[PDB]
Design a protein around this ligand. Structure first.
Ligand SMILES: [Ca+2]
Ligand SMILES: [Ca+2]
Ligand SMILES: [Ca+2]
Ligand SMILES: [Ca+2]
Ligand SMILES: [Ca+2]
Ligand SMILES: [Ca+2]
Ligand SMILES: [Ca+2]
Ligand SMILES: [Ca+2]
Ligand SMILES: [Ca+2]
Ligand SMILES: [Ca+2]
Ligand SMILES: [Ca+2]
Ligand SMILES: [Ca+2]
Ligand SMILES: [Ca+2]
Ligand SMILES: [Ca+2]
Ligand SMILES: [Ca+2]
Ligand SMILES: [Ca+2]
Length: 511
């Protein structure tokens, strides 16, 4: 007898037994056609040592209604044997072969925040732990725990999200029936949250009633033909007192003598000083002439003498001594290098008024008629020229060792809550800037300039802010704002604003 063709269809649509199919009944079908195969012939196959049988139907179709999933999972290859006859009774066997895959795995992917506990939802169908097991440990040492309430919870470890080691955690559960479930847990980075900070500072305002200023050149070192005198039309201009505001030196190599002149600011001040205010005590002029060498001073001292009045009418005499270093430089054909240079020293005098102490301090030189100009301590003057600057002082409360200050820490609750640190910790300040915008920069633990003062903010959040502006430049709105950036151990960053209200109190010791 002629053998026919036995074919076996795919064992399920994808030709693989999976974890769900494992617990089910599966139909197996095929064909048996040609040769001496007839409708009615016996079809047999052994799958995992159980025999399944059927007959060939019309058109050569055969099917087996219920093969166990568990049998096909145990045996991925088998023969189908069809037994046929011809008209004369000669037996023949036709043989087909089937193979399929067995993949009893299923996966579950999650993306979850570090350092938190999470309920795992939408687990694959049939998911569970083998009998007795309430906890499995993940590759990173976390756990998936089965609770009283039937829920699966994952304790996500904290990870270094910046390093060279992947933060995709994993665990495989294996069941007795051969199923596995792989849970992949992509651990997501956490970040600190910086919270805005508020601070304030009030600068004091007080008015002082002052006498006229008398300024005198009182001493000097080195120089030839040194004279000091009350200024005149020709030499220095006039002032309202007989104190000696002019000094001249040198043997003139061209026309006149070099020197200094100081014209007090008596008429603009109108007998009042303000506290915490840059005040010009007068105009300093440097007259630079060519003089033969050895003729010039190297320093000179000026006494600035005035009286301050108190609410009971008692007067305190005050003397501020101002020292200037002078460099009458060798003249060459280089104009810039030929300039003569004057440096004022940062002196002060402290006086008492109504039981409080106040300190008059030299700030330096400022351009004439430019109250908001840069203040310098050295000035440079060309040969055959005179420069003029305002000599600026400031009167402060106390011993003058410091400016009005406020301190704090940006990690504290400064009116809106403490900064949140996140799960990674090791948070530090890594950037600070005046304005709204900050990145990690090189200003942390440095002094930086605000609108009205300077800030030092350190990496641990501690800051000191001090008001450098004069009271006259502090409007009633006045706010400073500095942005800072914090960063955690693997680089996550957050910014917030340190806002400082800078007030002025205009009221006095009235009650
Ligand atoms: Ca399948
Ligand atoms: Ca099942
Ligand atoms: Ca036949
Ligand atoms: Ca087999
Ligand atoms: Ca197959
Ligand atoms: Ca296949
Ligand atoms: Ca990592
Ligand atoms: Ca992290
Ligand atoms: Ca404060
Ligand atoms: Ca005067
Ligand atoms: Ca005079
Ligand atoms: Ca004078
Ligand atoms: Ca000169
Ligand atoms: Ca010179
Ligand atoms: Ca803060
Ligand atoms: Ca982080």
């Amino acid at each position: 007898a002629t053998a026919g063709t036995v074919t076996v269809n795919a064992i399920t649509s994808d030709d693989t037994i999976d974890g769900i199919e494992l617990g089910q009944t599966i139909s197996i079908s095929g064909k048996a056609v040609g040769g001496d195969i007839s409708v009615g012939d016996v079809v047999k196959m052994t799958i995992n040592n159980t025999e399944y049988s059927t007959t060939v139907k019309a058109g050569g179709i055969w099917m087996i209604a219920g093969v166990l999933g568990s049998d096909l999972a145990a045996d991925s290859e088998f023969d189908v044997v069809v037994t046929s006859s011809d008209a004369a009774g000669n037996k023949v066997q036709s043989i087909g072969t089937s193979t399929h895959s067995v993949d009893l795995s299923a996966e579950a992917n999650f993306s979850l925040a570090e350092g938190q506990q999470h309920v795992l939802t939408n687990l694959p169908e049939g998911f569970g732990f083998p009998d007795g097991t309430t906890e499995v440990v993940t590759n990173f040492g976390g756990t998936i725990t089965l609770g009283d309430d039937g829920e699966y919870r994952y304790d996500a470890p904290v990870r270094d999200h910046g390093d060279a080691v992947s933060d995709k955690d994993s665990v495989t559960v294996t069941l007795e029936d051969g199923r596995t479930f792989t849970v992949n847990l992509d651990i997501q980075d956490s970040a600190p949250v910086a919270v805005d900070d508020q601070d304030s500072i009030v600068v004091q305002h007080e008015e002082f009633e002052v006498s006229e200023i008398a300024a005198s050149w009182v001493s000097y070192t080195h120089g030839e033909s040194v004279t000091t005198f009350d200024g005149t039309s020709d030499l220095g201009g006039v002032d309202n007192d007989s104190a000696k505001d002019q000094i001249r030196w040198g043997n003139p190599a061209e026309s006149k003598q070099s020197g200094y002149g100081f014209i007090d600011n008596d008429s603009n001040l109108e007998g009042r000083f303000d506290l915490n205010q840059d005040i010009s005590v007068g105009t300093f002029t440097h007259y630079n002439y060519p003089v033969y060498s050895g003729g010039a001073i190297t320093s000179a001292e000026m006494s600035v003498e005035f009286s301050v009045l108190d609410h009971l009418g008692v007067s305190t005499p005050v003397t501020l001594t101002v020292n200037f270093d002078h460099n009458e430089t060798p003249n060459t054909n280089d104009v810039n290098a030929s300039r003569d240079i004057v440096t004022v020293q940062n002196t002060h005098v402290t006086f008492e008024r109504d039981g409080d102490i106040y300190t008059v301090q030299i700030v330096g030189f400022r351009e004439v008629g430019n109250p908001d100009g840069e203040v310098v301590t050295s000035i440079y003057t060309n040969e055959n020229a005179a420069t003029s600057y305002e000599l600026v002082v400031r009167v402060v409360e106390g011993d003058g060792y410091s400016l009005p200050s406020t301190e704090g820490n940006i990690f504290d609750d400064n009116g809106l809550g403490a900064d949140s640190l996140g799960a990674d910790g090791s948070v530090t300040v890594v950037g600070v800037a005046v304005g709204a915008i900050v990145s990690s920069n090189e200003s942390v633990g440095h002094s930086i300039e605000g609108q009205y003062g300077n800030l030092v903010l350190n990496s641990d959040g501690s800051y000191v802010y001090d008001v450098t502006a004069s009271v006259s430049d502090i409007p009633a709105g006045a706010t400073e704002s500095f942005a800072y950036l914090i960063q955690d151990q693997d680089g996550s960053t957050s910014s917030a604003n340190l806002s400082i209200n800078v007030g002025t109190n205009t009221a006095s010791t009235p009650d």
